[PDB]
Amino acid sequence: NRHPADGKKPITIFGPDFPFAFDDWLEHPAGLGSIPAARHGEEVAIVGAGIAGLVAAYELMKLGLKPVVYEASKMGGRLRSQAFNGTDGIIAELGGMRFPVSSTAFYHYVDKLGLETKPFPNPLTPASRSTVIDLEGQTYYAEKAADLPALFQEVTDAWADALESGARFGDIQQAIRDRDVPRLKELWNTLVPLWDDRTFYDFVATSKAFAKLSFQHREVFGQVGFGTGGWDSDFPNSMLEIFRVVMTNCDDHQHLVVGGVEQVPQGIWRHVPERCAHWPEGTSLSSLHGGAPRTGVKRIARASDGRLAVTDNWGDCRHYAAVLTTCQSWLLTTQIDCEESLFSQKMWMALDRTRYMQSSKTFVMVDRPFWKDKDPETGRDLMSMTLTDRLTRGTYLFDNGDDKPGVICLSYAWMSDALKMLPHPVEKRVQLALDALKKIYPKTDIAGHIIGDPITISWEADPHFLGAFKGALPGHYRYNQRMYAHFMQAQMPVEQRGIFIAGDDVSWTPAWVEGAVQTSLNAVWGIMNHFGGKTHADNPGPGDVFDEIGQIALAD
Amino acid sequence: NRHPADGKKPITIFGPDFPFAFDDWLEHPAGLGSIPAARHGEEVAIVGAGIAGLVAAYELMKLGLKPVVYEASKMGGRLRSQAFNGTDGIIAELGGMRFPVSSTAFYHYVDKLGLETKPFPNPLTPASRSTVIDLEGQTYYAEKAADLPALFQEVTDAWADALESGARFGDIQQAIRDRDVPRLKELWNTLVPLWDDRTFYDFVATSKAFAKLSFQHREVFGQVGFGTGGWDSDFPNSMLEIFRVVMTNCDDHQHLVVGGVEQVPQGIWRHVPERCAHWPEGTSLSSLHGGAPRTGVKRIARASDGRLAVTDNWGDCRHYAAVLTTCQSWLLTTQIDCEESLFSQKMWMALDRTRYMQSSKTFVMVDRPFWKDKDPETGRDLMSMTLTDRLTRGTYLFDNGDDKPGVICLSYAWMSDALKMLPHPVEKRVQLALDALKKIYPKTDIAGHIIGDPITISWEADPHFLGAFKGALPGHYRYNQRMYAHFMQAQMPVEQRGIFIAGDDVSWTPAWVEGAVQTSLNAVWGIMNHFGGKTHADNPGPGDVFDEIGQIALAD
Ligand SMILES: Cc1cc2nc3c(=O)[nH]c(=O)nc-3n(C[C@H](O)[C@H](O)[C@H](O)COP(=O)(O)OP(=O)(O)OC[C@H]3O[C@@H](n4cnc5c(N)ncnc54)[C@H](O)[C@@H]3O)c2cc1C
Ligand SMILES: Cc1cc2nc3c(=O)[nH]c(=O)nc-3n(C[C@H](O)[C@H](O)[C@H](O)COP(=O)(O)OP(=O)(O)OC[C@H]3O[C@@H](n4cnc5c(N)ncnc54)[C@H](O)[C@@H]3O)c2cc1C
Ligand SMILES: N[C@@H](CCCC[NH3+])C(=O)O
Ligand SMILES: N[C@@H](CCCC[NH3+])C(=O)O
Ligand SMILES: N[C@@H](CCCC[NH3+])C(=O)O
Ligand SMILES: N[C@@H](CCCC[NH3+])C(=O)O
């Protein structure tokens, strides 16, 4: 139980758009349901061996199907843990790195695997010893929030007030705690039509609290943020997306997975459940595949026999009664030739109009966590978690024990600040970061502690992603609602049935692994239903309650 | 005279933020002023040989200085015309392509060089024979606006009414026509605090006209636009930016330069004025350089003698009393080591927070303008200017005469639609565009007419730009105001004087060539002033009236 020890019922990612108890579904001893025995052993294609792909595969295998996973690049997708030269257990998190404990469906799989987690070192948490804020050449050091000048407290207070006055934050959170669905939906559904079409930035600037403060206060709020770095990158996003972040504590109480979160997908791959339908004891996704996913998918089409024909990179064509796609949504045009008649024209527009955000990270390894040392004159740590308006933006320090090498994320950038780095090689990104940090820390010799190889990523640049994660712009609620409900196919024409989607791009909470796991499980219900299956009476699943508690539809 | 023949005083790009008559300044027989003879021949460095750099060089040469232009990549910057294999006069416009005749300072140079222009083929203009709109698989063909279904006219009506009700469009345009400065500033200054912090989308959705229409109406408005393609890409931008586009007719009455707009910067380079101060007859920028700009700049610092030290790619270091930089703003951090004390901390923030937009274009050549042929059954053109929600977005047809080859821009994309193409090679971009067009035109064999080589660009990818052009996000008014005014140095500390900036990123109107020219001319005044010069009493210039009619400052 990683929840904060505050004596309350815990905040979880429980809707608010679809407040279904994924955790309870997953933990119930009846299982996720059954498929008729005569269909046991039939294949279902799953494009993408990211977390959504492998979650859907694992559970469908448990239901007595043979998932067939395809993966065009690397195992784990945006959960990716690259090992530094010559080390064991020392990694850089290139995608997902800090996992809110509200992510109960994600953590089900973490615990099923027996993996260890620890608090992530976000600013001003017990996990981080100190934080340095550097803005317009003015540098502030703090071991607790009270060490900061008054403006920073004025900003936090205004933010908390805008959420309470503007969104009924307190009431929503209590309903989440209690899992009081009618109440949560009443409270949430009111916000949906009021904020789809307005931005994060608009919410802030027009709120009472910020409107009476200087421009500089909301500016500073953009650059330094509310617990997890500056979110000026997301000022443009629809406010509903942000409401979702804060209401479900995605931005608080976060852990990193010891040894790398890539152990989650790699472990699901290899995991042998005690009880599968159909399959013999000792069966895993890996044993069913003979060890690897298939190669990348090049084409999806409807075959004359009514099945879906999937052709790989090397022209191998295989037929399936159903196909789940988990690649980011653009790839169904840019990377796969997906026959158009497989989605409605309304669906294509959702898939095609979804915006993906940009992200950069640059990492080095260091011989020891030297930042813990004290400057004798000042009493400060030699280095801190760094928030700045310089090009690095966010710098994060990873302590692996005094007797092991440290890891430093030199820069974690979003959007514009990511785009600055796009065409530059690793050596240049490192240099620029180190020069930026030398300005903030003139006395600290970081370069002198650096060992191993540097590691960078730009998710935008990779043709298998075309972005770090979705970001909902204002007015995209309708596209999301279509994509999120696509697993409910009882009213679709026959020509559109049997193909499914999932991923954090399908979810209402992109950039958060829980969104990939929950939509993945919705698709599991959908695929089960497609094979003539159904949930157990004592353990109803997504599609059994979707029509009553799913996301509101808006007007045409 | 390329202005519309409507018998009115023409709309020009006259403010509204700084309603200075650049064209009058330029055309006045007295010239732009003078610099004391004792400083004739001294050097001023100019970073970048795009339009802002070459304009500033040209005029400073005329004032008796020796500009020294640096260029790290290609001549002309974002005015780029690439010639297709084996051809003469047949180009693709990779940057700037359609130049609003309201751009009177830009067209001063076009006409000084004697270049020929013709109306650009935008949808439903005399320059275009027909337009095809393709949305959610429904295709509409039109030779005049009246051929379109009713919804499209409801959209245009609502857009025009939102501008009239919401922005006093009529009154502002009249004040622009009359060059009534007090009135224009009154009418504009009211809008500045009201729309800095709000998006284009918010302007549209909350306007009376669109709020009573369906979502689908503003959705279609995003995909199809108001004369120059769909601008859903800019829905996130501050509304002040859009107001500036429409109020100054940037989006109407556009011409292309025959033979390519790159002839403008290449012609300025080579142009020999009748009278320069100091320089002998026959002097050009080219003759003054020996033919070529210097190579790229790697560093700018304050030398111990007070001058500015500029070090090129090859380590050659040269000293200057002044330096103009015209590269896009990020490059003063990514591409040049620009000493931090050379700009104020408020300026660095403007420079570093500015957002750059993405843009893609894919072009092919064809043996003849076969699109003009008629399908005998339908009476339609074989192909039209195409607006679509497919990945191409906008397709443009260039007729060079029946006896010459045609040029087709298969796709001109912004933002997300640009990002789709980022990592893909030209061949892939062409194929995707042709497969999208096949769907819209199943009977037209475009591929069969294609000849020559394909041409693509992604401005985001190029380390000498890092974007196509700035796009002001809500709340960016203050950063633009800082950048726009930086050429006024009378109250700066000494350590910050002598460096200047210019470019369409400095301007209020990014993505428009007139913004680069006007800011370039402000920099001209600033540099003249820096060398102890002044304008002629009968021809006052930017910095002589800036304190009285320049851009309003906003509160802290
Ligand atoms: C920089 C960054 C930081 C993040 N930080 C956090 C965080 O701190 N906390 C958090 O909770 N979440 C975080 N996330 C989000 C998290 O990583 C995602 O929600 C999740 O990993 C996405 O999972 P997915 O299954 O939806 O898709 P993916 O991980 O994208 O998996 C999809 C797979 O499809 C593959 N594919 C593509 N094309 C084809 C093809 N033609 N054929 C076959 N396969 C193909 C891809 O290679 C990929 O492996 C972060 C993401 C990024 C990018
Ligand atoms: C896709 C696109 C479409 C456009 N369409 C239109 C249009 O339709 N109508 C219109 O009016 N305008 C349009 N524009 C805008 C127009 O192209 C610009 O406003 C203008 O040409 C930019 O001039 P500039 O001098 O500001 O900068 P740039 O043209 O970027 O010039 C800066 C120069 O400096 C160089 N440089 C960079 N780093 C260094 C270094 N370290 N040292 C030396 N030099 C360096 C660059 O290589 C470049 O040559 C468009 C722009 C784009 C990208
Ligand atoms: N341009 C620098 C910052 C200089 C100003 C810092 N206050 C950067 O992005 O890192
Ligand atoms: N969940 C990620 C991304 C947050 C920004 C969302 N656009 C993080 O905590 O870093
Ligand atoms: N995915 C296709 C569009 C299919 C739907 C078109 N109405 C594209 O981006 O071009
Ligand atoms: N001048 C460019 C403007 C692009 C939109 C600017 N955000 C064009 O006409 O195509």
Side-chain angles (χ1 to χ4, degrees), chain A residues 118-130:
Chain A
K118 54 191 246 202
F120 189 90
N122 280 306
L124 303 176
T125 56
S128 161
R129 326 209 327 162
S130 69

mmCIF file of all heavy atoms in Angstrom, chain A residues 118-130:
data_model
loop_
_atom_site.group_PDB
_atom_site.id
_atom_site.type_symbol
_atom_site.label_atom_id
_atom_site.label_comp_id
_atom_site.label_asym_id
_atom_site.label_seq_id
_atom_site.Cartn_x
_atom_site.Cartn_y
_atom_site.Cartn_z
ATOM 1 N N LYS A 118 10.200 3.258 -5.417
ATOM 2 C CA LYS A 118 10.487 4.245 -4.336
ATOM 3 C C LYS A 118 10.066 5.665 -4.712
ATOM 4 O O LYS A 118 9.951 5.988 -5.873
ATOM 5 C CB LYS A 118 11.967 4.248 -3.962
ATOM 6 C CG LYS A 118 12.902 4.461 -5.125
ATOM 7 C CD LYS A 118 14.347 4.179 -4.687
ATOM 8 C CE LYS A 118 15.250 5.394 -4.690
ATOM 9 N NZ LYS A 118 16.725 5.092 -4.775
ATOM 10 N N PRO A 119 9.841 6.514 -3.701
ATOM 11 C CA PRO A 119 9.380 7.841 -3.998
ATOM 12 C C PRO A 119 10.264 8.523 -4.991
ATOM 13 O O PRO A 119 11.504 8.485 -4.883
ATOM 14 C CB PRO A 119 9.462 8.533 -2.648
ATOM 15 C CG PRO A 119 9.101 7.419 -1.669
ATOM 16 C CD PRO A 119 9.835 6.242 -2.242
ATOM 17 N N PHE A 120 9.629 9.177 -5.934
ATOM 18 C CA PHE A 120 10.362 9.918 -6.941
ATOM 19 C C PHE A 120 10.833 11.217 -6.353
ATOM 20 O O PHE A 120 10.130 11.804 -5.569
ATOM 21 C CB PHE A 120 9.458 10.140 -8.145
ATOM 22 C CG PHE A 120 10.165 10.708 -9.319
ATOM 23 C CD1 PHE A 120 10.760 9.864 -10.284
ATOM 24 C CD2 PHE A 120 10.286 12.103 -9.476
ATOM 25 C CE1 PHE A 120 11.417 10.408 -11.364
ATOM 26 C CE2 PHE A 120 10.951 12.637 -10.575
ATOM 27 C CZ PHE A 120 11.518 11.798 -11.495
ATOM 28 N N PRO A 121 12.058 11.683 -6.727
ATOM 29 C CA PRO A 121 12.580 12.932 -6.195
ATOM 30 C C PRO A 121 12.045 14.207 -6.875
ATOM 31 O O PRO A 121 12.782 14.932 -7.497
ATOM 32 C CB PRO A 121 14.105 12.774 -6.377
ATOM 33 C CG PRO A 121 14.280 11.873 -7.539
ATOM 34 C CD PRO A 121 13.068 11.001 -7.576
ATOM 35 N N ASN A 122 10.776 14.510 -6.651
ATOM 36 C CA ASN A 122 10.231 15.757 -7.103
ATOM 37 C C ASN A 122 10.601 16.872 -6.137
ATOM 38 O O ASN A 122 10.838 16.634 -4.933
ATOM 39 C CB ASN A 122 8.709 15.631 -7.172
ATOM 40 C CG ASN A 122 8.222 14.913 -8.424
ATOM 41 O OD1 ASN A 122 8.567 15.307 -9.560
ATOM 42 N ND2 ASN A 122 7.315 13.929 -8.236
ATOM 43 N N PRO A 123 10.589 18.109 -6.619
ATOM 44 C CA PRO A 123 10.937 19.226 -5.744
ATOM 45 C C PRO A 123 10.157 19.263 -4.401
ATOM 46 O O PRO A 123 8.966 18.964 -4.380
ATOM 47 C CB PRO A 123 10.637 20.473 -6.601
ATOM 48 C CG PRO A 123 9.725 19.988 -7.658
ATOM 49 C CD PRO A 123 10.185 18.585 -7.936
ATOM 50 N N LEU A 124 10.852 19.592 -3.319
ATOM 51 C CA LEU A 124 10.210 19.842 -2.078
ATOM 52 C C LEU A 124 9.378 18.680 -1.654
ATOM 53 O O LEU A 124 8.277 18.902 -1.236
ATOM 54 C CB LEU A 124 9.351 21.119 -2.147
ATOM 55 C CG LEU A 124 10.134 22.344 -2.559
ATOM 56 C CD1 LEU A 124 9.220 23.518 -2.705
ATOM 57 C CD2 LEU A 124 11.174 22.733 -1.516
ATOM 58 N N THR A 125 9.920 17.462 -1.750
ATOM 59 C CA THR A 125 9.327 16.278 -1.208
ATOM 60 C C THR A 125 10.356 15.650 -0.279
ATOM 61 O O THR A 125 11.541 15.946 -0.403
ATOM 62 C CB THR A 125 9.038 15.227 -2.307
ATOM 63 O OG1 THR A 125 10.259 14.936 -3.003
ATOM 64 C CG2 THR A 125 7.974 15.702 -3.299
ATOM 65 N N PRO A 126 9.944 14.738 0.626
ATOM 66 C CA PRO A 126 10.942 14.013 1.410
ATOM 67 C C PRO A 126 11.976 13.284 0.512
ATOM 68 O O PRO A 126 13.132 13.132 0.900
ATOM 69 C CB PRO A 126 10.098 12.995 2.202
ATOM 70 C CG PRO A 126 8.757 13.625 2.330
ATOM 71 C CD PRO A 126 8.572 14.500 1.123
ATOM 72 N N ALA A 127 11.581 12.901 -0.704
ATOM 73 C CA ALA A 127 12.530 12.229 -1.615
ATOM 74 C C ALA A 127 13.655 13.135 -2.151
ATOM 75 O O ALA A 127 14.663 12.668 -2.660
ATOM 76 C CB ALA A 127 11.772 11.611 -2.772
ATOM 77 N N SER A 128 13.495 14.438 -2.033
ATOM 78 C CA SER A 128 14.469 15.377 -2.558
ATOM 79 C C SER A 128 14.964 16.256 -1.425
ATOM 80 O O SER A 128 14.188 16.792 -0.651
ATOM 81 C CB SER A 128 13.800 16.229 -3.601
ATOM 82 O OG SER A 128 14.560 17.381 -3.786
ATOM 83 N N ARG A 129 16.253 16.457 -1.340
ATOM 84 C CA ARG A 129 16.796 17.151 -0.179
ATOM 85 C C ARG A 129 16.608 18.670 -0.348
ATOM 86 O O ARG A 129 16.375 19.393 0.626
ATOM 87 C CB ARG A 129 18.246 16.748 0.041
ATOM 88 C CG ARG A 129 18.519 15.272 -0.348
ATOM 89 C CD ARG A 129 19.633 14.643 0.455
ATOM 90 N NE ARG A 129 20.646 15.645 0.798
ATOM 91 C CZ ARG A 129 21.549 15.509 1.766
ATOM 92 N NH1 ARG A 129 21.638 14.382 2.493
ATOM 93 N NH2 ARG A 129 22.399 16.513 1.997
ATOM 94 N N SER A 130 16.675 19.141 -1.583
ATOM 95 C CA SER A 130 16.630 20.545 -1.841
ATOM 96 C C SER A 130 16.285 20.779 -3.296
ATOM 97 O O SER A 130 16.479 19.917 -4.173
ATOM 98 C CB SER A 130 17.991 21.224 -1.497
ATOM 99 O OG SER A 130 19.075 20.866 -2.383
#
